[PDB]
Ligand binder design. Structure first.
Ligand SMILES: [Mn+2]
Ligand SMILES: [Mn+2]
Ligand SMILES: [Mn+2]
Length: 430
DNA sequence: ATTATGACGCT
DNA sequence: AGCGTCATA
């Protein structure tokens, strides 16, 4: 009754860029704008691997992970932009720098949690309270929410898409109680007003379009964001959760897209998020552990407490390269050459990081994969990182992996290496 | 032969 | 610590 927590204490948004690497390349090259377009890495093997796809290209069935040669079969006029290569490897600096542009704008509105290269969570609870105190109990005009969808509306007693959006927004606004500064639905609405402002600023100041979700926690905000991509934002209210979740595959919820989610489906014999409500918290804990069980019990009711962390910068800086098929490294000179290439890119990024962000990494993690191992990583070893010097770091990395060579001979490396990974970690203020 | 990342959980 | 899981361009 009066004591059941409803998880409506916060206003949380998730802002996610549309087709982000494609937009970065479209800004740079106007010829790519408003075209079926994709971003590819490498080229020699099957035309290269696609890692981002414009919405025009998606209409032809082009997806991420697709080889460009195969994408061209679906979409002959597909335009491509290639990821930069430096020191023999893909280099993602352009996209990291574009990300910083977006993150710095968002940070003007609230403290953000960088969740990927192209998205961040915002806790807007305080900003909403402030905007509410200025407003005076005026109704919120539809004109303040020009790109907002209200999930679940319209409903009850037009054949165009923008028409439907407005109908839902109208129903939503008319149901509001703007007289109550503690009403969660009102708080979400004001959150959505602020996010319109945020998204307008991002587009004005970078040229990049994005989508967003507004809800009471990170999982619902993330889910909401995807509902009306691209270039739109979606409000998912607490009240909208039972209908939304009644047909929502469990795998769609963040963190349930892998083995845990599959086990929820298999063990319980269910399909949709809403079906979880019929289990006790103890039942869920018995199957999925104490933490997962409590999390699922609350999550299927729309409730989650994971805070928006105040962290705008990545906490690791890493350099990685695969050596697939017959390109696997089989000599000492090869292994050392590539460790140096990775280490030189790492030095570059680390030095820039120290100057920009007043911090220094203190641990170097070295990871390799061996031919025959299905696992992402075969071996991970750490050592000290005391100087930002590529030759030292590459010499150190070789030392910690040296004993992995099962070859009797010194000159050969066996079994051949199919991945090298250098990562700088454990930052301290400097 | 999707690749290049990056956060967090477990023991 | 080293490994595993999950995630995103
Ligand atoms: Mn995106
Ligand atoms: Mn994203
Ligand atoms: Mn994506």
């Amino acid at each position: 009754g009066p004591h059941m927590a409803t998880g409506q204490d916060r206003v949380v948004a998730l802002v996610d860029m549309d087709c982000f690497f494609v937009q970065v390349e479209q800004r740079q090259n106007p010829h790519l704008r408003n075209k079926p377009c994709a971003v590819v890495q490498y080229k020699s093997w099957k035309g290269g691997g696609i890692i981002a796809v414009s919405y025009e290209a998606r209409a032809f069935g082009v997806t991420r992970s697709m080889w460009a040669d195969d994408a061209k079969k679906l979409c002959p006029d597909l335009l491509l932009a290639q990821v930069r290569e430096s020191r023999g490897k893909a280099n993602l600096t352009k996209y990291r720098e574009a990300s910083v542009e977006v993150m710095e704008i968002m940070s003007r509105f609230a403290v953000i949690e960088r969740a990927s290269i192209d998205e961040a969570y915002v806790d807007l609870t305080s900003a909403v309270q402030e905007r509410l105190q200025k407003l005076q109990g005026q109704p919120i005009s539809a004109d303040l929410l020009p790109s907002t969808y209200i999930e679940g509306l319209p409903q009850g007693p037009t054949v165009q898409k923008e028409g439907m959006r407005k109908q839902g927004l109208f129903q939503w606004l008319d149901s509001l109680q703007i007289d109550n500064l503690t009403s969660p639905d009102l708080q979400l609405t004001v959150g959505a007003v602020i996010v319109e402002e945020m998204r307008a600023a991002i587009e004005r100041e970078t040229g990049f379009q994005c989508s967003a979700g507004i809800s009471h926690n990170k999982v619902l905000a993330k889910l909401a964001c995807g509902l009306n991509k691209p270039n739109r934002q979606t409000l998912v209210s607490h009240g909208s959760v039972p209908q939304l979740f009644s047909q929502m595959p469990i795998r769609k919820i963040r963190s349930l897209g892998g083995k845990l989610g599959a086990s929820v489906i298999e063990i319980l014999g269910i399909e949709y998020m809403g079906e979880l409500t019929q289990f006790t918290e103890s039942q869920l804990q018995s199957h999925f552990g104490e933490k997962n069980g409590s999390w699922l019990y609350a999550m299927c009711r729309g409730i989650e407490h994971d805070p928006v962390k105040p962290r705008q910068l990545p906490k690791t800086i890493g350099c990685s390269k695969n050596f697939p098929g017959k390109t696997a490294l089989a000599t000492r000179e090869q292994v050392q050459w590539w460790l140096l290439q990775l280490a030189q890119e790492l030095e570059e990024r680390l030095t820039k990081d120290r100057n920009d962000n007043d911090r220094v990494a203190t641990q170097l993690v070295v990871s390799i994969r061996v031919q025959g191992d299905k696992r992402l990583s075969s071996l991970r070893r750490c050592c000290a990182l005391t100087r930002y010097d590529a030759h030292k770091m590459s010499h150190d990395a070789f030392t910690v992996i040296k004993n992995c060579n099962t070859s009797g001979i010194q000159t050969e490396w066996s079994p051949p290496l199919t991945m090298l990974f250098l990562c700088a970690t454990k930052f301290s203020a400097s």
